[PDB]
Amino acid sequence: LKSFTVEKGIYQTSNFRVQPTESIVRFPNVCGPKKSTNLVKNKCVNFNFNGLKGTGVLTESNKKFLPFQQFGRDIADTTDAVRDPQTLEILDITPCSFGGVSVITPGTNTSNQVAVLYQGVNCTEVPVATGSNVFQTRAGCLIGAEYVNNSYECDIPIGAGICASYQTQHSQSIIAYTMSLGAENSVAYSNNSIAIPTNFTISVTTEILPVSMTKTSVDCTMYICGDSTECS
Amino acid sequence: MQMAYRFNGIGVTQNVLYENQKLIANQFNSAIGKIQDSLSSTASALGKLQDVVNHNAQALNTLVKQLSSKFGAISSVLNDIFSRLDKVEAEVQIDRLITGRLQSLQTYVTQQLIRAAEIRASANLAATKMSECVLGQSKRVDFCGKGYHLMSFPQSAPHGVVFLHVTYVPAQEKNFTTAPAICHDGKAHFPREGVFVSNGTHWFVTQRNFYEPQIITTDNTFVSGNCDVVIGIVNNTVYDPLQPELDS
Amino acid sequence: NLLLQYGSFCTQLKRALTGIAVEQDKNTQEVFAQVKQIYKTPPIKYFGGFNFSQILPDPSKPSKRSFIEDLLFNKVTLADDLICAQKFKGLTVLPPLLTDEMIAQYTSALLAGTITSGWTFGAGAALQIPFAMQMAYRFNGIGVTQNVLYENQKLIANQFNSAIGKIQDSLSSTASALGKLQDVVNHNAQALNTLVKQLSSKFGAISSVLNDIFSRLDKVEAEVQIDRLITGRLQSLQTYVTQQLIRAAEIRASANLAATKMSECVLGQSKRVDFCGKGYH
Amino acid sequence: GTHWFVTQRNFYEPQIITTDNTFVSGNCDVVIGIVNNTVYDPLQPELDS
Amino acid sequence: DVVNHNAQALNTLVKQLSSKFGAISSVLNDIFSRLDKVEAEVQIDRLIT
Numbered sequence A: 001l002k003s004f005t006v007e008k009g010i011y012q013t014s015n016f017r018v019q020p021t022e023s024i025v026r027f028p029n030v031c032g033p034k035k036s037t038n039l040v041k042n043k044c045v046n047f048n049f050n051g052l053k054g055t056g057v058l059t060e061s062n063k064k065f066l067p068f069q070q071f072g073r074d075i076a077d078t079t080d081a082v083r084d085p086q087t088l089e090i091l092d093i094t095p096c097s098f099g100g101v102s103v104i105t106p107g108t109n110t111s112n113q114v115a116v117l118y119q120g121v122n123c124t125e126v127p128v129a130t131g132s133n134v135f136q137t138r139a140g141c142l143i144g145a146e147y148v149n150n151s152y153e154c155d156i157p158i159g160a161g162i163c164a165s166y167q168t169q170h171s172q173s174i175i176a177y178t179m180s181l182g183a184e185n186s187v188a189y190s191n192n193s194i195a196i197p198t199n200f201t202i203s204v205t206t207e208i209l210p211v212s213m214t215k216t217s218v219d220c221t222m223y224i225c226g227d228s229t230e231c232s
Numbered sequence B: 001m002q003m004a005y006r007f008n009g010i011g012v013t014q015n016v017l018y019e020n021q022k023l024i025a026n027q028f029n030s031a032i033g034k035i036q037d038s039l040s041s042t043a044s045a046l047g048k049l050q051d052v053v054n055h056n057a058q059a060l061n062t063l064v065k066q067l068s069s070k071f072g073a074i075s076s077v078l079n080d081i082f083s084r085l086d087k088v089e090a091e092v093q094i095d096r097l098i099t100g101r102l103q104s105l106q107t108y109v110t111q112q113l114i115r116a117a118e119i120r121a122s123a124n125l126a127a128t129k130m131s132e133c134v135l136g137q138s139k140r141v142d143f144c145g146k147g148y149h150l151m152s153f154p155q156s157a158p159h160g161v162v163f164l165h166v167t168y169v170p171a172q173e174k175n176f177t178t179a180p181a182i183c184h185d186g187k188a189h190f191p192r193e194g195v196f197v198s199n200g201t202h203w204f205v206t207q208r209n210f211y212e213p214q215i216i217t218t219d220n221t222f223v224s225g226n227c228d229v230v231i232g233i234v235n236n237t238v239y240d241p242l243q244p245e246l247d248s
Numbered sequence C: 001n002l003l004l005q006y007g008s009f010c011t012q013l014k015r016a017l018t019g020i021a022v023e024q025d026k027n028t029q030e031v032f033a034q035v036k037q038i039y040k041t042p043p044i045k046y047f048g049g050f051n052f053s054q055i056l057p058d059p060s061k062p063s064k065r066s067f068i069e070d071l072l073f074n075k076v077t078l079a080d081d082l083i084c085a086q087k088f089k090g091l092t093v094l095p096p097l098l099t100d101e102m103i104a105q106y107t108s109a110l111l112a113g114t115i116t117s118g119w120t121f122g123a124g125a126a127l128q129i130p131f132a133m134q135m136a137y138r139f140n141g142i143g144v145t146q147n148v149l150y151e152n153q154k155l156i157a158n159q160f161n162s163a164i165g166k167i168q169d170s171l172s173s174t175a176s177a178l179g180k181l182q183d184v185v186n187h188n189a190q191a192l193n194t195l196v197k198q199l200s201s202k203f204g205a206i207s208s209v210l211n212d213i214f215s216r217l218d219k220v221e222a223e224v225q226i227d228r229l230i231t232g233r234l235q236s237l238q239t240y241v242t243q244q245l246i247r248a249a250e251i252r253a254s255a256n257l258a259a260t261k262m263s264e265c266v267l268g269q270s271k272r273v274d275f276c277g278k279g280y281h
Numbered sequence D: 001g002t003h004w005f006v007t008q009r010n011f012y013e014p015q016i017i018t019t020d021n022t023f024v025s026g027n028c029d030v031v032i033g034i035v036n037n038t039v040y041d042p043l044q045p046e047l048d049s
Numbered sequence E: 001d002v003v004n005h006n007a008q009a010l011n012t013l014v015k016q017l018s019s020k021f022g023a024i025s026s027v028l029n030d031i032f033s034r035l036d037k038v039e040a041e042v043q044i045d046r047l048i049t
């Protein structure tokens, strides 16, 4: 934000990437000056298949390919499956997990306790992609908040209905909860009866609407060239 | 009389203002004092106009800071191009700088055009709310104020306008027995206004918004059918106000 | 680092996309969450001879949506896998704040308010009222006296049930009736697919792969070719973000219209001609 | 036919022209294309007391 | 204003073919005739961009 004061809310920060654990090279079983390695499945590694490099989670895929078909591609022509030269069964390739990082905190006017959101990524790998308050959500993993079953109005939105609030917990901490949509009210329908109120009040509310914005105008040569004659 | 007009549009007869006139005025003045306290306390209330100011300031401060961008050139200072180069690459660097600054200016103009379309939509909405609630009474639900609309007052603001919507909310509930019609000696009575209410022993008519019982007469009801046609009909002797006048 | 020389394009692109993303949740909140309390269904189901049972939520469902809601959720074809290759190229999809279970609960609350209380649930507290006088004053809201529907309650009830059955048959039999939502999903899918497919464009350089330029050429000419590739890809991304902004203005106009339709025709009875369908509303 | 009636806007429900459903304004000279009726009053025969 | 916006946009699209955009000439075939193809495609590249 380029500011020394950060207010209350959810704020986007620099993202995170799951780096490859190893590097895997596959060559036919005459190859080049470099030599192949062993296969690693279901983990984030670098891959190489006869020159087709990259980083991906190689899988235990059961894809059926035609015998001449060495590679495959997605609908957007991105390479999704390869034929390993060592093992001619087909391995589907999915490059590793990542996501945007959002910081959920109350304002520095109030406090400096930090809860971190990892959007769309499961908590099974997030703190080693430090923890101590972990909540798993379909919208993404959450570090630094404790889940509370008590439903309230949404303080800071996270995603998939979960909202985070700053409350004393018995002490101040950040706690996540499923949002409350309001109270619950059953109106007993019965055709013998109506219900009409007796006393009425008068109340005043507020509505705010923008009408205009700042008028601006731009000189060509002064902006682009800055009073240079040969630039003009 | 203006309050008698505004109540007349929301299902309230003219007399109901004057029967609570001091109380209505006191509640109105208390609500004005409450919104004085709310505007004095909440410094985050004016979010949209401060957001308009922040949008304009951010757009100008990010267009101005793009002058220092090289856009892949040797420098954004043109005298470095004009003093440390021959012209055959200097024209290439000029082309890069002019194309980058013109692209940034095009981006700023496109952002201003999109935001001007959004601000024009908001200003058309504000002019419609002006013409419908300052110049009239809004018959459209949840347009000016939640509930039955009474007034709205325009207040000037930096790059915008602020309305003070005065609403009408019923508060104290009660339940009564009802009938779609009441049949007296083969005449189904349809009320011209109001719904039949029964307190247990007697039958009354009452307006749908606040409690106002009146004895069911022939003046407030009209007949166009018999007992059989109305489903869920009950019996009561419809009293005739002509009957004391017949004995006069 | 060569993208840093172009400066602050990426930050304002991220700001514009986040301003779209928060606006989507604001649109959903202002369309659906127009009611203070979650009203529930009463056990008495004789709604003046009507049949609201399949617009009301089905209690046998795991996620208790209504039957017509289940039809609309089944008719829309969805990019599920289409989500793989766009994910791998830096494009993410954020989940919506209000899940469809809570949209179902909000619609159930609006239904229970509209059915058990008329249009009074939007102003203050919901209060019970029968349907003979309710549809009679709504019939009085269109210029005919209240006595006609007291005479013809059963005929109008079976007419409304037959119209509900015809809508049920049409939404069971036609997936192409949901054109505009399928147009929204198709537009987003083709925009993302066009954005991913424009990485393959060489943009007049020797290759559309950055490693082919970087790993072999000398540094000045490789910087020239990467500048060409960055200029082409950034022009593509700026065009994508600009078209998303125009589509966001269109979606904002549609969501404001839908919120007005909710607040005027679900929470009331509109006097506008042909605003909520042909004929008197 | 020969019986002039007041009718609602959307449903053909004809009722006899009474003072309960009609109001009076002006004499029968300035208005255009107007006809005759024996206007009933339901309250009128009840007053014999 | 709608008609003038359409005519002005089409005309402004027309005269920017005269804009050389840092290339040697507005006409492509002059660049093809004067130079061989290798630098010519660079000049045409600037024109097309």
Ligand SMILES: *[C@@H]1O[C@H](CO)[C@@H](O[C@@H]2O[C@H](CO)[C@@H](O)[C@H](O)[C@H]2NC(C)=O)[C@H](O)[C@H]1NC(C)=O
Pocket (backbone or CB within 6 Å): A199, A200, A201, B023
């Ligand atoms: C309607 O409600 C208002 C309050 O909302 C009532 O006004 C109060 O009346 C009591 C008793 O007369 C006073 O002690 C209070 O000072 C009044 N004001 C407030 C703010 O409470 C009013 O009397 C009610 N009217 C009816 C007809 O019930």
Ligand SMILES: *[C@@H]1O[C@H](CO)[C@@H](O[C@@H]2O[C@H](CO)[C@@H](O)[C@H](O)[C@H]2NC(C)=O)[C@H](O)[C@H]1NC(C)=O
Pocket (backbone or CB within 6 Å): C051, C052, C053, C054, C067
């Ligand atoms: C209201 O209409 C629904 C939809 O036609 C009826 O629900 C059906 O009821 C039959 C008989 O019980 C079942 O065989 C169907 O499977 C039901 N369909 C659905 C979608 O639920 C319902 O019975 C009707 N209610 C009334 C009171 O007539």
Ligand SMILES: *[C@@H]1O[C@H](CO)[C@@H](O[C@@H]2O[C@H](CO)[C@@H](O)[C@H](O)[C@H]2NC(C)=O)[C@H](O)[C@H]1NC(C)=O
Pocket (backbone or CB within 6 Å): C155, C158, C159, C162
């Ligand atoms: C007015 O229109 C309604 C709607 O069609 C008519 O109701 C139908 O009448 C036919 C013929 O008697 C029946 O076969 C249908 O079953 C009726 N519909 C329903 C839902 O029951 C009605 O008859 C028409 N005429 C009048 C005077 O109301």
Ligand SMILES: *[C@@H]1O[C@H](CO)[C@@H](O)[C@H](O)[C@H]1NC(C)=O
Pocket (backbone or CB within 6 Å): A122, A123, A124, A136, A137, A138
């Ligand atoms: C997280 O991962 C575990 C196993 O890796 C899986 O069972 C669980 O469903 C995942 N969470 C979500 C929300 O999908």
Ligand SMILES: *[C@@H]1O[C@H](CO)[C@@H](O)[C@H](O)[C@H]1NC(C)=O
Pocket (backbone or CB within 6 Å): B199, B200, B201, B202
């Ligand atoms: C109902 O109202 C009448 C007024 O005519 C009154 O005499 C009677 O006591 C009331 N009954 C109850 C139960 O309040």
Ligand SMILES: *[C@@H]1O[C@H](CO)[C@@H](O)[C@H](O)[C@H]1NC(C)=O
Pocket (backbone or CB within 6 Å): A190, A191, A192, B231, B232, C044, C045, C046, C048, C049
């Ligand atoms: C009123 O409600 C009762 C109880 O549900 C029902 O038996 C009765 O038929 C209803 N009457 C009308 C006229 O709807």
Ligand SMILES: *[C@@H]1O[C@H](CO)[C@@H](O)[C@H](O)[C@H]1NC(C)=O
Pocket (backbone or CB within 6 Å): B233, B234, B235
């Ligand atoms: C009303 O009176 C009729 C006879 O005139 C009777 O049949 C009917 O049951 C009465 N209504 C009620 C609710 O008792």
